[PDB]
Motif scaffolding. Structure first.
Motif, PDB file in Angstrom:
ATOM      1  N   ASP A  15     -99.202 -46.412  44.389  1.00 42.78           N
ATOM      2  CA  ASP A  15     -99.233 -45.308  43.431  1.00 42.78           C
ATOM      3  C   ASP A  15    -100.302 -45.511  42.351  1.00 42.78           C
ATOM      4  O   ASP A  15    -100.846 -44.522  41.858  1.00 42.78           O
ATOM      5  CB  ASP A  15     -97.847 -45.060  42.835  1.00 42.78           C
ATOM      6  N   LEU A  17    -103.371 -44.316  44.113  1.00 46.45           N
ATOM      7  CA  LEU A  17    -103.337 -42.857  44.200  1.00 46.45           C
ATOM      8  C   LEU A  17    -103.621 -42.222  42.847  1.00 46.45           C
ATOM      9  O   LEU A  17    -104.290 -41.177  42.772  1.00 46.45           O
ATOM     10  CB  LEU A  17    -101.990 -42.353  44.753  1.00 46.45           C
ATOM     11  N   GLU A  32    -107.344 -40.929  49.777  1.00 45.77           N
ATOM     12  CA  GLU A  32    -106.048 -40.359  49.429  1.00 45.77           C
ATOM     13  C   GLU A  32    -105.165 -40.300  50.665  1.00 45.77           C
ATOM     14  O   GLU A  32    -103.982 -40.710  50.625  1.00 45.77           O
ATOM     15  CB  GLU A  32    -106.238 -38.963  48.849  1.00 45.77           C
ATOM     16  N   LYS A  33    -105.729 -39.820  51.763  1.00 49.19           N
ATOM     17  CA  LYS A  33    -104.920 -39.674  52.983  1.00 49.19           C
ATOM     18  C   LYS A  33    -104.439 -41.016  53.484  1.00 49.19           C
ATOM     19  O   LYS A  33    -103.258 -41.175  53.911  1.00 49.19           O
ATOM     20  CB  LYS A  33    -105.720 -38.977  54.047  1.00 49.19           C
ATOM     21  N   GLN A  34    -105.281 -42.040  53.420  1.00 44.36           N
ATOM     22  CA  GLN A  34    -104.910 -43.345  53.854  1.00 44.36           C
ATOM     23  C   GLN A  34    -103.856 -43.956  52.955  1.00 44.36           C
ATOM     24  O   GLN A  34    -102.920 -44.598  53.449  1.00 44.36           O
ATOM     25  CB  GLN A  34    -106.141 -44.233  53.891  1.00 44.36           C
ATOM     26  N   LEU A  35    -103.984 -43.793  51.662  1.00 37.05           N
ATOM     27  CA  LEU A  35    -102.964 -44.263  50.715  1.00 37.05           C
ATOM     28  C   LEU A  35    -101.628 -43.582  50.948  1.00 37.05           C
ATOM     29  O   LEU A  35    -100.602 -44.255  50.911  1.00 37.05           O
ATOM     30  CB  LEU A  35    -103.431 -44.010  49.288  1.00 37.05           C
ATOM     31  N   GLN A  36    -101.609 -42.277  51.191  1.00 35.31           N
ATOM     32  CA  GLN A  36    -100.370 -41.581  51.479  1.00 35.31           C
ATOM     33  C   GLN A  36     -99.742 -42.122  52.769  1.00 35.31           C
ATOM     34  O   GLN A  36     -98.508 -42.250  52.841  1.00 35.31           O
ATOM     35  CB  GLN A  36    -100.616 -40.095  51.582  1.00 35.31           C
ATOM     36  N   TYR A  37    -100.566 -42.425  53.772  1.00 36.36           N
ATOM     37  CA  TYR A  37    -100.028 -42.979  54.999  1.00 36.36           C
ATOM     38  C   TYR A  37     -99.346 -44.316  54.720  1.00 36.36           C
ATOM     39  O   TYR A  37     -98.195 -44.550  55.165  1.00 36.36           O
ATOM     40  CB  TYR A  37    -101.126 -43.098  56.061  1.00 36.36           C
ATOM     41  N   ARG A  92     -98.104 -45.369  51.977  1.00 36.71           N
ATOM     42  CA  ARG A  92     -96.928 -45.084  51.174  1.00 36.71           C
ATOM     43  C   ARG A  92     -95.791 -44.702  52.078  1.00 36.71           C
ATOM     44  O   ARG A  92     -94.671 -45.159  51.886  1.00 36.71           O
ATOM     45  CB  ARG A  92     -97.287 -43.938  50.210  1.00 36.71           C
ATOM     46  N   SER A  93     -96.067 -43.851  53.061  1.00 35.04           N
ATOM     47  CA  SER A  93     -95.015 -43.367  53.932  1.00 35.04           C
ATOM     48  C   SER A  93     -94.390 -44.531  54.699  1.00 35.04           C
ATOM     49  O   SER A  93     -93.146 -44.567  54.848  1.00 35.04           O
ATOM     50  CB  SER A  93     -95.497 -42.275  54.869  1.00 35.04           C
ATOM     51  N   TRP A 118    -109.382 -39.955  59.609  1.00 35.82           N
ATOM     52  CA  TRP A 118    -108.750 -39.712  58.323  1.00 35.82           C
ATOM     53  C   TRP A 118    -109.408 -38.542  57.610  1.00 35.82           C
ATOM     54  O   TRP A 118    -109.208 -38.328  56.406  1.00 35.82           O
ATOM     55  CB  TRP A 118    -108.910 -40.926  57.433  1.00 35.82           C
TER      56      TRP A 118
END
Lengths: 94, 137
Positions: free
Chosen positions: A8, A11, A31-36, A38-39, B117
């Motif tokens: 976070d 992010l 951002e997309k990689q960080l969200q992944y 995180r999930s 990505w």
């Protein structure tokens, strides 16, 4: 920081930098990689194969090591969270 | 991963450790390399011309290309960078350098940028910035 706090933190910085540079593809990818990450931290039942396709470390060192050391640090640490998670190892960051 | 990939990873890990990068951060530097292609340490002599993409307004980095014809995407970098004083996205600048001293470099193939990505080019890494002199542009 806990592992989720490291993600976070990254992010937060990515979102701040997107306000400075809206639409910048490097940051949208990060951002997309960080969200992944995180999930998969939050739900162990999700597929983790994409952890070995992360490029966040490369982004940190090739894009931001000189221009944004604060972001580079957060992305290095997030990448480390990702790969330790993928490898089944303790996230041994402070 | 196979015995060659593991050997290339160990070559890189040893190199980065020897250049004052700690083990957790070294993972990120390693993420810039494709261990399915050879990774080797070489010593450059003085007088070797190299090139480096940088954001406008940014200082010297650690990654070099062997030719000015190589484009950013194949090196794993975006063709656009950040002009911090102006808060703009603008094309990366290609700068020229020349080695001034004998210097050890890590030679590898980039992990290049694909659309997951959203072939790799060869690259050199050295964080011994003072061994590479900026040339007039």
């Amino acid at each position: 920081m806990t592992p989720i706090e490291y993600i976070d933190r990254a992010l937060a910085l990515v979102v701040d930098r997107l306000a400075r540079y809206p639409g910048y593809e490097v940051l949208l990818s990060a951002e997309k990689q960080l969200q992944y990450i995180r999930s998969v931290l939050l739900d162990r039942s999700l597929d983790r194969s994409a952890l070995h396709r992360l490029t966040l470390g490369s982004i940190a060192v090739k894009e931001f090591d000189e221009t944004d050391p604060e972001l580079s640090r957060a992305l290095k640490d997030a990448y480390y969270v990702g790969i330790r998670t993928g490898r089944g190892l303790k996230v041994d960051l402070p | 991963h196979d015995i060659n990939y593991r050997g290339n990873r160990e070559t890189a890990a040893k190199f980065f450790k020897s250049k004052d990068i700690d083990p957790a951060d070294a993972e990120s530097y390693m993420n810039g390399l494709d261990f399915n292609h050879p990774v080797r340490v070489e010593t450059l002599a003085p007088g070797k011309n190299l090139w480096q993409y940088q954001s406008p307004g940014a200082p010297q980095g650690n990654w070099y290309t062997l030719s000015p014809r190589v484009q950013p995407t194949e090196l794993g970098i975006n063709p656009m960078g950040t002009n911090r004083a102006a808060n703009t996205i603008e094309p990366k600048v290609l700068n020229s350098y020349r080695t001034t001293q004998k210097v050890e470099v890590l030679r590898s193939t980039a992990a290049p940028t694909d659309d997951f990505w959203s072939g790799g080019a060869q690259q050199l890494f050295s964080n011994e910035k003072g061994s590479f002199g900026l040339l007039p542009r």
